Write a protein that binds this ligand. Structure first.
Ligand SMILES: COCCNC(=O)c1ccc(-c2ccc3c(C)cc(=O)[nH]c3c2)c(Cl)c1
Ligand SMILES: [Zn+2]
Length: 209
């Protein structure tokens, strides 16, 4: 039931989405090992993901979290990178998109830094890089990220020195780097229904000059 609508680069929605991409790149402590070396992206396409069934699944859960949290969904827009992006846009987030060995427990991870999500585009740790060149820093091959609507409800705050249940009380976990003062948060949900993949972003990382 999914349809994809191209946003025009002249459209203001294309532009605020690109801005959130570009403005949340940071340097990474792995020197670019997982996601490659770059400061900015070349944005190639931005599509809006439309699936009535997945949307209702999301808003139905959103209402429930909302009611449990002093009428507050605590709804964010957050990046998600994964080899399973084409499956997510068609069938939604589920247990199979969960990071079993994740630091904040076994759920689905999202990132405020788009460059954090880019590290996972070719799998945990960048896997072996693009399918074509086996290059985690490939500047040629087209990559895809999702920019997603995520319901956090009451988030459990977990300071970090950088499918399970949420801790009782909580609808999600915030993993908040405490050492790297420029690293933004990651969040973990334990139910697929708590994220909708609104935008599919197709891009290349750009070689620095
Ligand atoms: C035991 O393996 C079973 C198969 N599953 C995967 O191969 C898998 C699971 C999770 C992820 C994953 C992880 C963490 C992030 C974070 C932090 C940010 C983000 O944007 N995406 C993530 C994506 C991946 Cl790539 C693969
Ligand atoms: Zn490549």
């Amino acid at each position: 039931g999914t349809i994809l609508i191209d946003l025009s680069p002249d459209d203001k929605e294309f532009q605020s989405v690109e801005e959130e991409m570009q403005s949340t790149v940071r340097e990474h402590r792995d020197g670019g090992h997982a996601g490659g070396i770059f400061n900015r992206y070349n944005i190639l396409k931005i599509q809006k993901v439309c699936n009535k069934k997945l949307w209702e699944r999301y808003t139905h859960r959103r209402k429930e979290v909302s009611e449990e949290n002093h009428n507050h969904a605590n709804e964010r827009m957050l990046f998600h990178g994964s080899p399973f992006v084409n499956a997510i846009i068609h069938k939604g987030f589920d247990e199979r998109h969960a990071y079993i060995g994740g630091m904040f427990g076994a759920g689905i991870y999202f990132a405020e830094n788009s460059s954090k999500s880019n590290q996972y585009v070719y799998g945990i740790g960048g896997g072996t890089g693009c399918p074509v060149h086996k290059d985690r820093s490939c500047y040629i091959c087209h990559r895809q990220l999702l920019f997603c609507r995520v319901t956090l409800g009451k988030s459990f705050l977990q300071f970090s020195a950088m499918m399970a249940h949420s801790p009782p009380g909580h609808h999600s976990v915030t993993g908040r780097p405490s050492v790297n003062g420029l690293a933004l948060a990651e969040y973990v949900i334990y139910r697929g229904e708590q994220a909708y993949p609104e935008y599919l972003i197709t891009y290349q990382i750009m070689r620095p000059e």
